[PDB]
Amino acid sequence: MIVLFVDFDYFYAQVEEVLNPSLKGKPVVVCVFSGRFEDSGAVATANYEARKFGVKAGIPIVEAKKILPNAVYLPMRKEVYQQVSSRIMNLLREYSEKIEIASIDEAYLDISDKVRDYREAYNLGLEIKNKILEKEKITVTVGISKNKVFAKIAADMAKPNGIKVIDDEEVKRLIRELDIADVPGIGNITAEKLKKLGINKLVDTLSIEFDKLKGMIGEAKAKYLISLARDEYNEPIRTRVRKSIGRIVTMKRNSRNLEEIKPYLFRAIEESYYKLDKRIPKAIHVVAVTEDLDIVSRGRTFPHGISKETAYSESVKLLQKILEEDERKIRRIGVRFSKFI
DNA sequence: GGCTACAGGACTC
DNA sequence: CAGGAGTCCTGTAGCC
Ligand SMILES: Nc1ccn([C@@H]2CS[C@H](COP(=O)(O)OP(=O)(O)O)O2)c(=O)n1
Ligand SMILES: [Ca+2]
Ligand SMILES: [Ca+2]
Ligand SMILES: [Ca+2]
């Protein structure tokens, strides 16, 4: 198989520049303002000019400002970025019927039936890059390899505005050398453990006893790493169908008083229903982010679709459950709907 | 034993 | 000083 993965560069920030070219050359930080106080909130992303200096997704806005007080801080305008994203995805659809839209920012294309080899694949990549540039003036990075994992890794290595191929031989190389923490799906926790029995690289999962790997990280993850190490990983590029839709908001102050939380919970329900559009869910979960930043949830599944009215009453019951079984105070509250008809 | 629901864990962008 | 959205896996307990 030949997979070509596309990753839009610093997407949110770049869209902002496209819309306001004077931002070009400046550090731009896209933020999610929470409303608690002057600049409370976090960074969603930032462009290369801000990133070179340590401004990264997730850090507090206030901290980012300590680092770059004269950078341009803009509020996230997701609806805008989604519109630009949709237009770009449609352009990619022209290069292949088998396409997987992984997120607002990434897409995987199985171009096996399009090119006979990596030379042609690379050229196809150039072609896509230029098309996107000429139509939307957005730069992207292309990664090409035998499966999704290594195509993604390829682009991680080449961004921004790059393109890169990883042949069978580098796959083998990578398997020996590549930091196993740099493998998609391996986070700090998990990595700690694999760079905890000398597994420091993919190849190491092959020699370790299996029940050992699996005792640390679980069966699915071990299998996954092993399959990659054997260079036998294969996952089909398939149309992604949304499985849940929800909304979560940060409350002005923490609380565990029901009447004080309700308004937030209710607004989250309203916005969620809106996004549902024509989908009818049978399951509803109320999600709470506690004062220590821990996540708790309670859900219920019905044998029929959930009306907005049933959503309202059922959410209050689930929220009560949360409160009555966790003595912590809540900081963020939302709902997530799933199991669509 | 293995399938279901549910709740927590971990990861990704 | 810590926002928003979405996915997959796993432990536990009921049930066949
Ligand atoms: N913690 C995060 C991480 C990422 N994002 C969003 C999701 S889509 C948007 C894309 O930004 P970039 O292209 O700058 O991110 P990278 O592709 O470089 O990782 O980043 C976000 O909102 N919060
Ligand atoms: Ca990305
Ligand atoms: Ca990106
Ligand atoms: Ca990692």
Summarize the SSE layout with pairings.
Layout: E1 3-8, H1 11-19, E2 28-33, E3 41-46, H2 48-51, H3 61-67, E4 72-75, H4 78-92, E5 99-101, E6 106-110, H5 118-136, E7 140-145, H6 148-158, E8 163-165, H7 168-177, H8 188-194, H9 204-207, H10 210-217, H11 219-229, E9 244-255, H12 258-276, E10 281-290, E11 295-301, H13 308-324, E12 330-340
Parallel strand pairs: 2-4, 7-8
Antiparallel strand pairs: 1-6, 1-7, 2-3, 5-6, 9-12, 10-11, 10-12
Helix pairs in contact: 4-5, 10-11, 12-13
The structure holds the ligand Nc1ccn([C@@H]2CS[C@H](COP(=O)(O)OP(=O)(O)O)O2)c(=O)n1 and calcium ion (3 copies).
Residues 7-8, 10-12, 44-45, 57-58, 104-105 line the site of the ligand Nc1ccn([C@@H]2CS[C@H](COP(=O)(O)OP(=O)(O)O)O2)c(=O)n1.
It binds a DNA duplex (13 and 16 nucleotides) through strand 2, strand 3, helix 3, helix 8 and helix 11.
Give structural notes:
GO terms for molecular function: damaged DNA binding; DNA-directed DNA polymerase activity; magnesium ion binding. InterPro entries: DNA/RNA_pol_sf, DNA_pol_Y-fam_lit_finger_sf, DNA_pol_Y-fam_little_finger, DNA_polymerase-Y, DNApol_IV, PolY_HhH_motif, Rev_trsase/Diguanyl_cyclase, UmuC. The active site is at residue 106. The protein is α+β, with helices and mostly antiparallel strands and 341 residues long. It folds into four domains: 2-10 and 78-166, Reverse transcriptase/Diguanylate cyclase domain (Alpha-Beta Plaits), CATH 3.30.70; 11-77, 3-Layer(aba) Sandwich (MutS, DNA mismatch repair protein, domain I), CATH 3.40.1170; 167-233, DNA polymerase, domain 1 (Orthogonal Bundle), CATH 1.10.150; 244-336, Dna Ligase, domain 1. It contains 13 helices and twelve strands. It has helices spanning 11-19, 48-51, 61-67, 78-92, 118-136, 148-158, 168-177, 188-194, 204-207, 210-217, 219-229, 258-276, 308-324; strands spanning 3-8, 28-33, 41-46, 72-75, 99-101, 106-110, 140-145, 163-165, 244-255, 281-290, 295-301, 330-340. A five-stranded mixed beta sheet has the order 5-6-1-7-8. Strands 9-12-10-11 form a four-stranded antiparallel beta sheet. α10 (210-217) crosses α11 and α12 (258-276) crosses α13 (308-324). The protein starts with a strand and ends with a strand. One calcium ion (CA) is lined by residues 7, 105-106. The structure holds a DNA duplex (13 and 16 nucleotides).
